[PDB]
């Protein structure tokens, strides 16, 4: 249609990913990166606690996870949570006026899981989250319902039978491309083989479909815009599948592709039973998690913001 002439100006950012002149380069907008950081800032960690006194399970009667911690630490981990999840509706969000131990309001129930959820991440999935970790903020960023949560997208409108063609619509999911645009469910939620790049010189070995690769391209797109980078970041395009060449990040993300599965298959999906309507998608599936959920357009959530470190209750006990 029309030709672009400059919606962004020079000189853009630069990051040499590969050997001199390999094409592998990262180009980022200066200002945007600024605003992103600025508006994408964490919340100062709370003051250290006495870490002494009695234990959680000692006094508090209905505690199933934060027992290891003491009182001050636990009271602390209760504060943090409220500022990170529902700093808007106060403690009454996951509790009952007076019943500091009741489990009537679903917000609590999940909170329990969500707790184990986080911990796990920082404790067992360190190849991905590294020595940094994630907190309720990383996803909730101060909102009862994480803004960047997903669900099985229904797709385009119903032509009364021939509607299955779910690849003709620019969904923000895939960086405004025209791919299936719903790779999150089949992949991030399921476990469909992402690999299609034949490993043999001649044909007759790989039965992969052309559509299949389009699907992978889908997911990749989405992932690419989730962390907010360019494939160069993870790979050298001439070797989409040669790892011996592709980039350390490539692997790091690998694990996440499953760390996400884990988060949906063993935590987010089970809670649906208690989650209300406004939290359930059209297909009845609950709002799950995606690379976009945490990362939210930044290779390293909150630009390497190390929050979990200052919170011992946010680690497997």
């Amino acid at each position: 249609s029309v030709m672009l002439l400059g919606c962004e100006g020079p000189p853009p950012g630069t990051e040499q990913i590969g050997y001199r002149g390999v094409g592998m380069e990262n180009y980022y907008n200066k200002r945007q990166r600024a605003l992103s950081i600025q508006a994408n800032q964490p919340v100062e960690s709370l003051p250290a606690a006495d870490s002494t006194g009695p234990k959680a399970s000692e006094v508090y009667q209905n505690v199933q996870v934060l027992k290891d911690l003491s009182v001050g630490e636990f009271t602390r981990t209760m504060v943090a949570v409220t500022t990170w999840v529902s700093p808007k509706e106060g403690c009454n969000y996951c509790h009952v006026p007076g019943n500091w131990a009741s489990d009537d309001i679903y917000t609590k129930v999940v909170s329990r899981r969500m707790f184990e959820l986080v911990r796990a991440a920082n404790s067992d999935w360190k190849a991905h989250v590294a020595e940094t970790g994630v907190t309720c903020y990383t996803c909730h960023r101060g909102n009862p319902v994480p803004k960047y949560a997903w669900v099985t997208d229904p797709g385009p409108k119903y032509p009364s039978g021939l509607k299955p063609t779910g690849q003709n619509y620019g969904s923000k999911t895939v960086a405004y491309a025209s791919l299936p645009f719903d790779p999150l469910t089949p992949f991030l939620d399921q476990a469909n083989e992402i690999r299609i790049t034949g490993n043999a010189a001649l044909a007759g070995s790989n039965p992969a479909s052309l559509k299949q690769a389009e699907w992978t391209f889908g997911l990749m797109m989405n992932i690419s815009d989730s962390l907010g980078v360019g494939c160069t970041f993870c790979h050298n395009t001439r070797a989409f599948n040669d790892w011996t060449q592709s980039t350390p990040k490539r692997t790091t993300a690998w694990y996440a592709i499953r760390h996400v599965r884990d988060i949906n298959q063993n935590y987010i999906w089970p809670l649906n039973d208690v989650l209300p309507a406004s939290r359930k998608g059209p297909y009845g599936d609950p709002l799950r998690v995606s690379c976009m959920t945490c990362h939210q357009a930044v290779n390293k959530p909150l630009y390497g913001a190390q929050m979990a470190k200052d919170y011992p209750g946010l680690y497997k006990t």
Binding site: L162, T165, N168, Y169, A200
Partner: protein
């Protein structure tokens, strides 16, 4: 109107030329010629008449079915909401039949309309090829155009006839979509290890490039010599003239050698017609003969070697 033989400064008009007499059996031309001052300021102003016989009518009607089918489904997905139609036009497109049908005739829903609108577009071209063949011999003309158009058609069918069918799945076929078809060529490459290393694909580029190159030379040269009547190639091919008489010397002195006013047009032909020739092939080989053109290259010591400043592990072998 800057005159570097760019825009016809002053135009003139004569009675609508109803084409030259055709042979017996060829229907008389139709359409009252039109005149456009602007258009004519680029080249010719008169318009039509146009020929339309059996093959022609049978074609204009045929392919016009495919287009409808396509544009139809497109406006169908948008739930017949033109608003969102003219919005997602680029994205909208008629997707091919799912792999769960191979080559069998799918229902209008799951890939049917595509196939139908496909055959109607396949023959529409094959038929149109004959339409051109009938316009050549009817004027005692040769079939250089058909030969070329054929070549193009070759690569056209490679995207559905010879390759997909040779693969046993209508899935390996380009879809009816402005954007989605860009993804097709985008995916195809990814699926087959990067077409940059595919031999034929390179050879074909040499043409997409060469082509552009030559015309940039020719189209230009003819103009630069348009002074000495260098545009009238015909009478130049018959009896060489001063235009073509310096027109070559230039190239000769510049690059050493050269060709004749006629000759060149022959190069151009083979530099353009050979484009798709190396097209249908490079794709006819992909999927069937080869599956990963990258390893294929290095297999023959083609792929270049680069130092290792960056490398990633492999959780598969590890775990």
């Amino acid at each position: 109107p800057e005159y570097q033989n760019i825009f016809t400064a002053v135009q003139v008009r004569a009675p609508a030329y109803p084409g030259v007499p055709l042979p017996k059996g060829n229907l008389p031309r139709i359409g009252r010629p039109i005149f456009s001052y602007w258009l004519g300021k680029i080249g010719d102003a008169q318009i039509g008449p146009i020929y339309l016989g059996l093959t022609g009518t049978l074609s204009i009607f045929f392919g016009l079915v495919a287009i409808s089918i396509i544009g139809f489904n497109m406006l169908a997905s948008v739930h017949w909401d033109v608003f969102q139609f003219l919005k997602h036009f680029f994205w909208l497109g008629l997707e091919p039949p799912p792999p769960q049908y191979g080559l069998r005739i799918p229902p209008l829903s799951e890939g049917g309309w595509w196939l139908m609108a496909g055959l109607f577009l396949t023959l529409s071209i094959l038929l149109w090829w004959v339409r051109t063949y009938k316009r050549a011999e009817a004027l005692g003309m040769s079939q250089h155009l058909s030969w070329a158009f054929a070549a193009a058609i070759f690569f056209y069918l490679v995207l559905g006839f010879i390759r997909p069918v040779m693969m046993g799945s209508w899935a390996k076929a380009v879809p009816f979509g402005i954007f989605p078809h860009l993804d097709w060529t985008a995916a195809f490459s990814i699926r087959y290890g990067n077409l940059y290393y595919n031999p034929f694909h390179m050879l074909s580029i040499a043409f997409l490039y060469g082509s552009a190159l030559l015309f940039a030379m020719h189209g230009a040269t003819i103009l630069s010599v348009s002074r000495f009547g260098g545009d009238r190639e015909i009478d130049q091919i018959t009896h060489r003239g001063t235009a073509a008489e310096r027109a070559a010397l230039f190239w000769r002195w510049t690059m050493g050698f050269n060709v004749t006013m006629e000759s060149i047009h022959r190069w151009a032909w083979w530099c353009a017609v050979l484009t798709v020739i190396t097209a249908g092939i490079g794709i006819l080989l992909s999927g069937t003969v080869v599956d990963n053109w990258y390893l294929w290259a290095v297999k023959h010591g083609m792929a270049p070697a680069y130092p290792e400043v960056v490398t990633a592990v492999n959780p598969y072998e590890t775990a």
